[PDB]
Amino acid sequence: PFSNPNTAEAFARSFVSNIVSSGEFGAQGAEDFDDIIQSLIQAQSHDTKAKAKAMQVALASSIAELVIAESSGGDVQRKTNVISNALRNALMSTTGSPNEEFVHEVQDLIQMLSQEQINE
Amino acid sequence: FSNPNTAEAFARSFVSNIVSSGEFGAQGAEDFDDIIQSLIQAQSMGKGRHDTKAKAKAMQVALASSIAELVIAESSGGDVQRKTNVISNALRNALMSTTGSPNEEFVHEVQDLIQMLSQEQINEV
């Protein structure tokens, strides 16, 4: 989905809409996701495979870190399931595919970052 | 990384340290430069209407993960410990030079991300 800058723009709009609709995040939380995803999508703009991988991981890691920073510890599993659902749905509606690898990366990153000193 | 003037200087110093290490070739150094410059622009843009502590953490993690992923991408699996040591040393010197702390929390984040990303399907060869 991060092939086309227009597909990327369309995925971002759809993901943030899925976050707003969940009822799990307030005004500021949905805005946090929007500011961060919009920034990284815009940055993702000659390409190498290595650079594409770095940008895909930067986006996955930014989403994972927001889940932790928005959560209060005990609700990380609930917010992980809500963000996983929002992601799967936006990918499926914008691409016809659920991009399970991208979702796996975000889930793995959420679990690793729940233990980093930046989040202690 | 909240101070644009510092951010830019850190980018230049870090990339200089990567080039001087001799551990990364010309393409590697180019990939690092392009990615670190994009993530600085992202750090500024990520402030949007009102900067928040949660957004600042998300953008520091995005920068750390982008560095960790290129370490994996620029090798092909084998020499990960040497490259982790060289990148950690390049980062510490660039942080000390531009801030006067080694910011070992940020460096540890990058070392943890190298460990975890070296497991992921995107990195399978």
Numbering used by the authors:
A (entry chain A): 10 to 54, 60 to 134
B (entry chain B): 11 to 135
Quote the study that presented this structure, word for word.
The model could be built for most of the protein, excluding NT residues 1 to 9 in subunit A and 1 to 11 in subunit B, C-terminal residue of subunit A and loop, including residues 55 to 59 of subunit A. All the obtained structures were compared to WT MaSp NT in order to determine the overall structural similarity and to identify structural differences for the key residues. The high-resolution X-ray structure reveals more details on pH-dependent interactions between acidic residues of monomers. The most obvious such interaction occurs among Asp 122 and Glu 130 of both subunits. This interaction is possible only at low pH and requires that at least one of the acidic residues—presumably Glu 130—is protonated. This interaction in turn may alter the relative placement of α-helices and favor necessary interactions between monomers, such as salt bridge formation among Glu 40 and Arg 59 of the other subunit. However, this salt bridge is present only in one side of the dimer, since the loop, including Arg 59 is disordered in the other monomer of our crystal structure. The intersubunit salt bridge formed between Asp 40 and Lys 65 in MaSp NT is also present between Asp 41 and Lys 65 in FlSp NT and an additional interaction between Asp 44 and Lys 65 was identified. Based on the X-ray structure of FlSp NT, Glu 130 was identified as a promising candidate as its protonation would favor dimer formation by alleviating the electrostatic repulsions with negatively charged residues present at the dimer interface, and this supposition agrees with major chemical shift changes of Gln 131 upon dimerization of FlSp NT.
NTs from the major ampullate spidroin (MaSp) and the minor ampullate spidroin are monomeric at neutral pH and confer solubility to spidroins, whereas at lower pH, they dimerize to interconnect spidroins in a fiber. However, the protonation events involve a different set of residues than in MaSp, indicating that an overall mechanism of pH-dependent dimerization is conserved but can be mediated by different pathways in different silk types.
